[model samples]
Target: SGAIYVGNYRVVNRHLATHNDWANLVWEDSSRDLLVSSTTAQGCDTIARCDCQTGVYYCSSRRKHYPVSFSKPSLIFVEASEYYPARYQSHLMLAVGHSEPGDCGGILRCQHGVVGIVSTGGNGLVGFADVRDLLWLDEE
Candidate 1:
């Protein structure tokens, strides 16, 4: 559910917590980075993958908007907006899931305008069954 940035850039958030958000991974880096920002004048897909840790989806195909940064909380709000908006559009799909109950660590995004919330499956989407239906369909 949490990720770290690949490169280094001291973000100045006055409202940031006194406790270290990345304190755990300071030495033990058992984490992966989603959106990494570098000091380059590139656009769109300056990075390879989205900043899932930060909840920012990186559009790799666009080049004019490279090195763009978005707050993780904003991404979460976008999803909430669609679910309550009076004039909201529909392009997003909610894929909420989980390996079991009492688990709320999930993935949310705005696809085309609609917002979606999918399960995080704990350690990442790897040991999960998101696409297992495809395999079962093939068996038929």
Candidate 2:
């Protein structure tokens, strides 16, 4: 599995690239600021979703520590360190979408880590179904 850090939260790509119908999402934290570094584990070329172009998990309550910034590769590795500049921890580094497969120009609304999104504008916000996997890092 590939991993990336967005502030205290850690986003991991949990799969061997051969598994289909699999979705993994988790919110983790580090006692220290999770630095953005280089990753060799390789990231996902296609973002996880319920269907071909629908059922996306959007995050809105993103704070300075966990803003949405997946404009580039979704999978990255950071040299976990206990010392460094604090600026690395400023502003959410990961965008809600924009990862490899990307948002497909869709909308993501996340609040308090409870992700919600709208694939194509229709009306008010709606919940997701295909995405029901949630676990803590310690649980692993």
Candidate 3:
């Protein structure tokens, strides 16, 4: 599964609009443990969105994460945030889960441009296709 966040950060000597700073990403199951008390139980895991610029971070222990690699569609957005410096745009994408450096991940777009590859990080299939259904069908 993919997770999204809208965060706030401050930059010294910079002009970053604080509107709509959002991030969307998916995690590989390797990062957490799956637990089932019974046949029909729940699983748990820990996840975070790390800010590459200042090392600021946000974490959630209840997020349902799965192995995310290249060529997946998921949407990440900032509800209300300022625009960050354009120079750090790429960095922001990393923070938003573009897989960061050393990651060979990719994003695939749907038939419509609305579901195409984003220059930054990839993971947005918010309202397109049967993405949610695929997860359950493909899971073990």
Candidate 4:
């Protein structure tokens, strides 16, 4: 009962973007015990636009295809910033916990809607790329 990291890619800041992860039904059955009840999906409003912060946000990720484990959901309390890493301009959304190897591409959901996608992170810190921009680029 877990997820499989099927495809991943690099985003604006050289951060990894997971295309999709597959999960088993058994895992879904058990997730209710580990996770808070599902909430409404808020669409990402800051996609191609700029915002000083994402308000407060929550994110979740699953372990690798094996082992059947999940990362506890996290709360993001830090302010977001528009920064440039390399030649690309990107918004860096910060969160309270660390990210695992297979955590990239996890969705960052806000009370307002889906805001960002997990990119990369280390101990006590995770970074996300704005979802609005990603969708805007796809429409380009």
**Candidate No. with top TM-score:** 4
Show where candidate 3 strays beyond 4 Å.
1-62, 71-83, 88-140
- Per-residue lDDT of model 1, residues 5-121, tens digit only: 223311111112124534422221111111122322222211222323212222222211112122232212111221133322222222222222222222233222101122222
Tens digit of lDDT per residue, candidate 4, span 69-120?
2223333333332321223223455555656555655555544444555655
Candidate whose lDDT is highest: 4
Q: Report the alpha-carbon TM-score of model 4 versus the true structure.
A: 0.39
Q: TM-score rank, highest first?
A: 4, 1, 2, 3
Steric clashes per prediction: 10, 15, 26, 5
Question: What TM-scores do the predictions have?
Answer: 0.19, 0.18, 0.17, 0.39
lDDT of each: 0.21, 0.25, 0.21, 0.36
Q: Residue 58's C-alpha lDDT in candidate 4?
A: 35
Model 3: residue 69 alpha-carbon error in angstroms? 0.7
TM-score of 1: 0.19
Over 21-107, each residue of candidate 2 has an lDDT whose tens digit, in order, gives 123222222321121232334432222322132222433332212233232212223332232222222112133332222221123
Better of 1 and 4 by TM-score: 4
Q: Model 3, range 29-90, lDDT digits (tens) per residue?
A: 21111111111222232122221121221112222222222323233332222323223221
RMSD of each: 17.6, 15.9, 17.4, 14.4
How does model 2 score by TM-score?
A: 0.18
* Worst window of 10 by summed lDDT in candidate 3: 30-39
